[PDB]
Enzyme design. Structure first.
Site, PDB file in Angstrom:
ATOM      1  N   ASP A  43       3.417 -38.200  15.491  1.00  0.00           N
ATOM      2  CA  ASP A  43       2.993 -38.768  16.770  1.00  0.00           C
ATOM      3  C   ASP A  43       4.196 -39.459  17.399  1.00  0.00           C
ATOM      4  O   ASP A  43       4.821 -40.327  16.785  1.00  0.00           O
ATOM      5  CB  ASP A  43       1.841 -39.760  16.589  1.00  0.00           C
ATOM      6  CG  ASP A  43       1.363 -40.360  17.905  1.00  0.00           C
ATOM      7  OD1 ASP A  43       0.638 -39.698  18.610  1.00  0.00           O
ATOM      8  OD2 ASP A  43       1.728 -41.475  18.194  1.00  0.00           O
TER       9      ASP A  43
ATOM     10  N   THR B 159       4.074 -39.885  26.841  1.00  0.00           N
ATOM     11  CA  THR B 159       4.790 -40.796  25.956  1.00  0.00           C
ATOM     12  C   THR B 159       6.180 -40.265  25.635  1.00  0.00           C
ATOM     13  O   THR B 159       7.169 -41.009  25.675  1.00  0.00           O
ATOM     14  CB  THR B 159       4.010 -41.029  24.648  1.00  0.00           C
ATOM     15  OG1 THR B 159       2.687 -41.488  24.954  1.00  0.00           O
ATOM     16  CG2 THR B 159       4.713 -42.062  23.782  1.00  0.00           C
ATOM     17  N   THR B 160       6.280 -38.971  25.319  1.00  0.00           N
ATOM     18  CA  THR B 160       7.567 -38.399  24.942  1.00  0.00           C
ATOM     19  C   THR B 160       8.317 -37.849  26.148  1.00  0.00           C
ATOM     20  O   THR B 160       9.544 -37.720  26.104  1.00  0.00           O
ATOM     21  CB  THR B 160       7.387 -37.282  23.897  1.00  0.00           C
ATOM     22  OG1 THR B 160       6.542 -36.256  24.431  1.00  0.00           O
ATOM     23  CG2 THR B 160       6.765 -37.837  22.625  1.00  0.00           C
TER      24      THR B 160
END
Lengths: 518, 543, 534
Positions: free
Chosen positions: A48, A81-82
């Protein structure tokens, strides 16, 4: 001690690039694993992107700023998020030779990045396609995108029901020239609040229009449905009335004790008479209700709910309209709660609740989750949040952007077309964003296992001459159309991703010195 | 203890392709790239060179530096040999190859970092080269017509002298153009017979004074004094000149020939013998009408006494090259022997005199309005040792560039001051954009390398490249009344040193480059860059 | 790109570390596969050394430094609880899968391409398993077969002589507690006890329970025939006057006579217990009486019982008191005051065994004990540890076969046939990808680590033994017959595991392949090692 001038610029970019590398494998359904080696004897393989960034210490303040970017993104939207971390790192890397080799002043670098953002935001819109957010079946197909490849995939029909009905209810769908334009503001964290009640199964969950109260009642056997609801909100308890000044009571004859007891009963009754005078049907008090007051009110033809905090009374007031009054004696006849469907006091899972479900939509709702255990209730909630985040992102804008790196490549090509038309030194840092955007389709190819140059070059050529719906097949690694292989993502995520990535890069690029001190 | 893999040849640490041998080789070249980068342009920088023999010079010339440097690393030798190519059959372009070849390697590294192979990069560069060479053919504005007029020569000589000596360009241009116009014949459309060897023009310098007293001599200037009594010839025309390689003294004997004296009478008899034999040799010279004698060797006392009595000017020229050049002034053929300067081997000089240049006396063999020499001498002066020596080199470069004006369209003129380089960037980019596949990556970067020239020209002039370069690009990225660009083919770097802004029109100063120099540099620079890129490993071994 | 107090392991070095470490862990456990494997000594640093072959114990107690080896060891431990066996099989499969994958990765094969091939081959392997398995009869009268299962699970971990002792012990113990009805099977109905001072060969099956505390009177029977069982929770030790009192007397003889009167408090309870026998088969032939009192019994109370040929035991542990109520059928009495003839249980021979240091009481020959006991013998903790592991695992092995009718012929026939199956099915189908077929071939080859290791440990050359199995296997298929062909680890030739009696668990092999596939995939998908804070 301190790092000055080009030392700050190199140090800030160097650290940010290191952060980006950490998570380059986290992009796409074929994301690869990283081995996190703890100071202890353990090791974590969790892939994650959030956990990887959280659980790995960073040294340079610039890396900590990168971590804050991901934290901000997580609060704004449910994804990216990434994306914001990888993109922001590449933007800094592309600006690196311009600070050093071209000796372009950071002020010039920042100005071009702001212009490149404006243009990138336009392109993301231009390549996006509408979806009818009022077609529930179409919405279910979108929501499942965040539910599949999970154990709870077999819940996806109910998860979509719960997410879609709740977000539609709270969506501030309004516009006018007087009370203003909420512009479809959605805040599921405050308005869609979810409650977990033991008992039943996932299929028994329901979205309520009203407030779900967890407090018990004065008697389990009271009217559950009212034809003409009238609701009272009070702070002050129902108990013996005392004065504010000095009182001295001296009793000699025992016979006068009964007179005091009769007075104590009357003072409690008098409080209840003021409540009953305005013909209520449900009375809610923050503080407690004496045994006498409990019978005094119930016998008057109303229900009494106790120990409900001001915070809950504010929610009750929004869905009833009842005004909160501090002192019992000051209760006004204007305190009403009509058009409320039920005051159900059902005990569910051996726990008493009170429901104020009505026919109103006062920009709020409650999700009631059912389940045979706390683990089931948590599993439903934790996975439902993903569904609700997508429902928010979609219902906040009907435009969907193509996935598979298509949107980012379209921005790269379109920025190049504008770059040729941009005069002045700013032309150079302007290109930096155009090139940086391709980190996404490039990374997707690498994680798929293809040739990062030969496939990326073909992808760019397809956008240069053809349509902007061409992307990378996550499973095959081939260049495929994103309509044939639907991998579409809400525009909301793509717009915030490029926005916060460039802004974050600007925050680090404009810092030419880090100094120590307290 | 520490193991190593892959190193099995005489224990050498020899990096493989995966170890970045190409990147490391380029890094070594970058050291020389920066050294040469600051040389180009009218405002180029000087370098101090300390020769191992204890001689300190200053020059602007990169080729001089490269020859004075002891170059070890093979990656640099590839480019230094490329520099020598610019010196062979061409008189210019040294900086163009060193600078361009380095930049082509620098942008190659940017492509290597992508994962683009050296093979793919080299293939793209070869295509962009062939495109570049074709595009240059269409950038011609004017053409040298090879009429050898002083004014046509100045158009080329001036920009050639520029970037070696700045501020004296007009003075040196007159000195070279005058000397060149002296040796060049009057002719048109004659390309069958080669002429104008670079050696046809000599440059001579004396310490002291300044170029304000410089001139050009129609003939040769020798640093030797008139050894004999006669120091000058008369004002008459066509003084017969005899040239000898044999020393002007008694003839020797191939075998022995040693004279031994035992009696006083023998001393008297041999003394009279030698004096009579020398007189006979000096008499036979005078009897042919010779009024000046040039020796490749020394002169005996008796020969001086007789040559003086015959009124013959005695001038020693020990240099075999000066004697060969003398054949291009007076026509005399050096006599292998002594005392028989056949009239056919005699030359003619109108004037032989001594002149004072810079305080030093020299002997001059010249003609004025007749029997005109095929050689010219340029006379330089200057008080500062380092500056005068470099000015001499500037003279040689001017002459060499004129030689570059050769039958195969050497006269084709392209706008200079970077104007050609800027237009190439636009055209080569379009070639990249129209080329499918990975080839476009190297073709585009090939174009990028060409901005180093307008960049370097700006940097040396004290200008901010971050304002000049976008102004140059905007100056060429314009809307014209038609597909073909006109007014904005001439926008170049303004080497002024002014404050605010702008570009300058080539037409204002007639700044043109030679096509032959440009296309040659494009070939050499690309071959040098692609040669280095092809080398993924260096191994040393006994041969 | 480096932050202080951190490291990023790149340039495929993370894969080199993962594979190198896995080969280390493989090398350790590879030496311990099959009945031909070796023993390990585990030293706890305190002077106690454990001897075992059990992979679960080995991986659990063996110190591991390599973070990668820790991952594999812990993942195998997870499979141990899921499957009950297969520890070494999983580790060997993971190691060879990583070794074969590494050779291809060096050649430019992306780790994901191999991983996808592993997942395809795994799914195809499970399909083969379904056609490979043999359906066992549901009859519980399959003792002749279950003996072969017990031998398969025991022989791997014992010295092959102990096998002859334990085989009937594991087999009959589980069949005894396994109701011959479609009910259930709980191996916890067989208790595991240990005793010292006898050879491990003397491990014995006991039909009932065994108690530690024996009789403490020489005249009580050591053998009680067809006993009745009294279950009693109250002390029979000398009792004192209920309330504070004293001995107030005039003559010396009155001192002891008054004490004798005080004794009546407990003697009354003794009489009631003695009368209990008198009411229930008091003088009947071939009947006895035993008391398993949880609390103490006075030496004088024991004398009362001894005179009546009653075996009165004392200070029994609660654990046996509760079980013995289920074993003997009797009810526990919290007090003799409630004593009645309907309380007594019934059993056959009750036997007291005496050895040098200890006594043991046996409560065998019960009508429906619903419980068995196995007594593991040994002189030291070496035999006791190894035998205990063999018994506990053997009971589980035969339990799983009785519960799950699916049996897999062993001797390597499963894994060798998988190799042939995947080799041919892959070339026959080619439905994966031009590149992915590489991973499938790597998977099929890695499966052979098991039959190859089994042979190597035997001293036979794997190069010849595997070839002979493949030859006979091909001949059977060309002959259009079904035949199971495996490895004879004693002769070196091929054998038929369904005639020799070599059987593997369906569930263990199913999950062993699936687990090993995941473990190797989880490491193959690791591109970089990320260290911080250390």
């Amino acid at each position: 001690e301190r790092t000055t001038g080009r030392q700050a610029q190199i140090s800030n970019i160097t650290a940010a690039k290191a952060v980006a590398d950490v998570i380059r494998t986290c992009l796409g359904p074929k994301a690869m694993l990283k081995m996190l080696l703890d100071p202890m004897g353990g090791l974590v393989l969790t892939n994650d992107g959030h956990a990887i960034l959280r659980e790995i210490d960073v040294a340079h303040p610039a890396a900590k700023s990168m971590l804050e970017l991901s934290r901000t993104q997580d609060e704004e939207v449910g994804d990216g998020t990434t994306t914001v971390i990888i993109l922001a790192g590449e933007i800094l890397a592309q600006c690196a030779p311009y600070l050093i080799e071209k000796n372009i002043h950071p002020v010039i670098i920042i100005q071009a990045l702001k212009k490149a953002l404006t243009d990138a935001l336009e392109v993301i819109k231009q390549v996006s396609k509408p979806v009818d957010v009022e077609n529930d079946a179409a919405m279910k197909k979108l929501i499942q995108a965040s539910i599949g490849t999970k154990y709870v995939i077999h819940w996806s029909e109910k998860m979509c029901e719960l997410a879609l009905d709740a977000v539609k209810t709270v969506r501030k769908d309004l516009g006018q020239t007087v009370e203003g334009e909420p512009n479809f503001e959605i805040d599921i964290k405050r308005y869609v609040r979810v409650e977990k009640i033991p008992g039943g199964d996932v299929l028994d969950s329901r979205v309520l229009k009203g407030v779900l109260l967890n407090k018990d009642v004065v008697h389990p056997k009271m009217s559950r449905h009212i034809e003409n609801p009238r609701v009272v909100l009070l702070d002050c308890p129902l108990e013996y009335k005392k004065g504010e000044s000095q009182t001295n009571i001296e009793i000699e004859k025992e016979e006068d004790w009964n007179r005091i007891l009769q007075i104590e009963e009357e003072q409690v009754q008098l409080m209840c008479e003021q409540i009953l005078a305005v013909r209520p049907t449900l009375v809610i008090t923050e503080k407690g209700v004496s045994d006498l007051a409990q019978h005094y009110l119930l016998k008057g033809g109303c229900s009494v709910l106790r120990r409900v905090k001001k915070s809950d009374n504010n929610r009750i007031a929004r869905v009833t309209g009842a005004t909160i009054v501090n002192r019992v004696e000051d209760l006004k006849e204007s305190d009403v709660g009509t058009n409320c469907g039920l005051f159900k006091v059902e005990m569910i899972g051996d726990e008493y609740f009170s429901f104020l479900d009505n026919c109103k939509e006062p920009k709020a709702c409650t999700i009631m989750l059912r389940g045979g255990s706390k683990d089931i209730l948590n599993e439903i909630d934790r996975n439902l949040q993903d569904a609700m985040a997508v429902a928010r992102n979609v219902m906040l804008s009907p435009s969907l952007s193509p996935g598979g790196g298509a949107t980012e490549m379209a921005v790269s090509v379109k920025l190049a077309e504008k770059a040729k038309q941009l005069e002045g030194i700013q032309q150079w840092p302007y290109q930096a964003v155009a090139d940086a955007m391709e980190c996404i389709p490039r990374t997707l190819i690498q994680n798929a296992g293809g040739d990062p140059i030969r496939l990326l070059s073909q992808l760019r050529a397809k956008h240069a001459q053809g349509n902007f719906t061409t992307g990378i097949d996550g499973d095959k690694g081939k260049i495929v159309d994103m309509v044939s292989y639907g991998i579409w993502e809400p525009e909301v995520i793509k717009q915030q991703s490029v926005k916060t990535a460039i802004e974050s890069a600007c925050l680090l690029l404009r810092v030419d010195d880090i100094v120590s001190g307290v | 203890q520490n193991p190593n893999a892959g190193l099995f040849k005489q224990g050498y640490n020899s990096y493989s392709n995966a170890d970045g041998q190409i990147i490391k080789s380029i890094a070594a070249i970058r050291e020389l790239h920066q050294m040469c980068l600051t040389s180009m342009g009218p405002c180029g920088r000087n370098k101090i060179i300390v020769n191992h023999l204890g001689k300190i010079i200053i020059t602007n010339d990169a080729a001089t530096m490269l020859r004075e440097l002891d170059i070890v690393h093979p990656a640099v030798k590839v480019l230094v040999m490329a520099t020598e190519q610019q010196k062979i059959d061409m008189g210019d372009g040294t900086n163009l190859v060193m600078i361009l070849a380095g930049e082509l390697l620098n942008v190659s590294e940017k492509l290597i970092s992508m994962g683009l192979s050296a093979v793919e990069i080299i293939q793209g560069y070869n295509m962009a080269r062939k495109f570049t060479l074709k595009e240059l053919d269409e950038m011609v504005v004017g053409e040298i017509t090879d009429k050898n007029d002083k004014n046509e020569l100045l158009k080329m000589i001036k920009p050639v002298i520029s970037s070696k000596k700045y501020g004296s360009e007009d003075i040196l241009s007159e000195l070279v153009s005058e000397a060149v116009s002296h040796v060049l014949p009057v002719a048109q459309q004659a390309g069958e017979i080669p002429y104008f060897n670079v050696d046809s023009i000599r440059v001579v310098k004396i310490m002291g004074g300044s170029l304000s007293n410089s001139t050009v001599i129609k003939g040769m200037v020798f640093n030797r004094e008139p050894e004999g009594h006669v120091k000058s010839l008369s004002e008459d025309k066509k003084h017969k000149v005899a040239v000898f390689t044999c020393p002007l003294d008694i003839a020797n004997t191939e075998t022995k020939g040693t004279v031994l004296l035992h009696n006083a009478q023998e001393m008297l008899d041999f003394s009279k013998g030698e004096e009579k034999q020398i007189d006979a040799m000096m008499k036979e010279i005078a009897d042919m009408g010779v009024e000046c004698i040039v020796a490749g060797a020394g002169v005996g006392e008796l020969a001086l006494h007789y040559l003086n009595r015959y009124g013959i000017l005695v001038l020693k020229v020990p240099s075999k090259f000066e004697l060969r050049r003398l054949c291009r002034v007076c026509g005399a053929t050096p006599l292998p022997r002594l005392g028989a300067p056949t009239p056919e081997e005699l030359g003619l000089v109108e004037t032989v005199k001594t002149m004072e240049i810079g305080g030093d006396r020299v002997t001059v063999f010249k003609q004025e309005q007749g029997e005109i020499s095929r050689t010219s001498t340029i006379i330089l002066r200057g008080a500062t040792q380092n500056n005068l020596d470099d000015i001499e080199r500037a003279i040689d470069d001017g002459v060499a560039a004129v030689k570059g004006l050769m039958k195969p369209s050497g006269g084709k003129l392209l706008p200079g001051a970077g104007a050609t380089e800027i237009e190439l960037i636009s055209r080569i980019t379009k070639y990249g954009e129209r080329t499918p596949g990975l080839l476009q990556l190297a073709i585009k970067q090939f174009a990028v390398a060409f901005e180093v020239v307008p960049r370097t020209l700006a940097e040396t002039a004290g200008l901010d490249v971050n304002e000049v370069l976008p102004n140059l690009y905007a100056a060429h990225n314009v809307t014209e009344p038609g597909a073909v660009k006109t007014d904005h083919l001439y926008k170049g770097v303004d080497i002024d040193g002014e404050s605010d802004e702008g570009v300058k029109d080539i037409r204002e100063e007639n700044i043109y480059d030679m096509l032959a120099t440009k296309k040659f540099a494009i070939n050499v620079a690309t071959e040098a860059a692609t040669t280095v890129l092809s080398i993924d490993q260096i191994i040393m071994a006994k041969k | 790109l480096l932050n202080p107090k951190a490291e990023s392991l790149r340039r495929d070095a993370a894969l080199k570390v993962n594979v190198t470490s896995a080969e280390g862990l493989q090398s350790v456990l590879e030496t311990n596969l099959g009945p031909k494997g070796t023993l390990k000594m585990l030293v706890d640093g305190a002077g106690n050394i454990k001897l075992t072959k059990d992979g679960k114990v080995l991986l659990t107690e063996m110190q591991i430094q390599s973070p990668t080896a820790v991952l594999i060891a812990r993942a195998a431990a997870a499979q141990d609880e899921i499957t009950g066996d297969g520890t070494t099989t999983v580790v060997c499969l993971v190691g060879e899968l990583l070794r074969q994958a590494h050779r291809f990765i060096q050649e430019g094969v992306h780790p994901r391409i191999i991983t996808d091939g592993f997942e395809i081959a795994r799914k195809e392997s499970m399909k083969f398993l379904d056609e490979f398995k043999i359906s066992k009869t549901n009859l519980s009268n399959d003792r002749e077969f279950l003996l072969q299962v017990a031998r398969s699970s025991l022989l791997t971990k014992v010295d092959a002589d102990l096998t002859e002792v334990l085989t009937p012990i594991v087999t009959d113990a589980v069949l005894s507690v396994y109701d011959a009805q479609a009910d259930n099977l709980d191996l916890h109905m067989v208790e595991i006890m240990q005793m010292q001072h006898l050879s491990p060969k003397d491990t014995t099956f006991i039909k009932g329970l065994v108690l530690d505390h024996g009789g403490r009177h020489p005249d009580m029977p050591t053998r009680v025939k067809n006993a009745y069982v009294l279950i009693l929770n109250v002390s029979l030790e000398y009792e004192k006057t209920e309330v504070n009192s004293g001995f107030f007397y005039s003559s010396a003889d009155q001192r002891d006579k008054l004490a004798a009167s005080e004794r009546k408090f407990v003697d009354a309870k003794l009489k009631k217990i003695i009368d209990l026998k008198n009411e229930v088969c008091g003088m009947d032939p071939d009947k006895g009486f035993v008391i398993i009192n949880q609390k103490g019994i006075d030496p004088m109370s024991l004398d009362v019982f001894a005179k009546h040929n009653i075996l009165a035991l004392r200070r029994a542990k609660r654990r046996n008191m509760e079980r013995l109520q289920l074993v003997t059928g009797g009810e526990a009495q919290n007090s003799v005051e409630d004593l009645s003839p309907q309380i007594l249980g019934f059993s056959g021979l009750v036997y007291q065994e005496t050895i040098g240091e200890e006594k043991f009481t046996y409560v065998t020959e019960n009508t429906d004990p619903k419980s068995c006991t196995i007594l593991i013998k040994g002189s030291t903790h070496y035999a006791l540890a190894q035998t205990k592991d063999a018994v506990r695992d053997g009971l589980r092995a035969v339990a799983n076969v009785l519960k799950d009718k699916n049996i897999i012929p062993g001797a390597g026939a499963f894994y060798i046939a998988l190799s042939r199956y995947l080799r041919s099915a892959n070339m026959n189908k080619l439905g994966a990808k031009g590149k992915t077929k590489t991973g499938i071939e790597a998977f099929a080859e890695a499966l052979l680590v098991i039959p190859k290791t089994l042979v190597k440990n035997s001293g036979f050359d794997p190069l010849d033994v595997l070839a002979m199995v493949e030859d006979e296997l091909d001949d059977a298929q060309d002959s259009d017959e079904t035949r199971y062909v495996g490895v004879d680890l004693n002769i070196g030739d091929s054998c038929d595991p369904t005639i020799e009696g070599i059987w593997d668990s369906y569930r263990v092999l199913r999950n062993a392949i699936t687990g090993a596939t995941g473990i190797a995939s989880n490491l193959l998908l690791c591109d970089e090692l990320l260290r911080a804070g250390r």
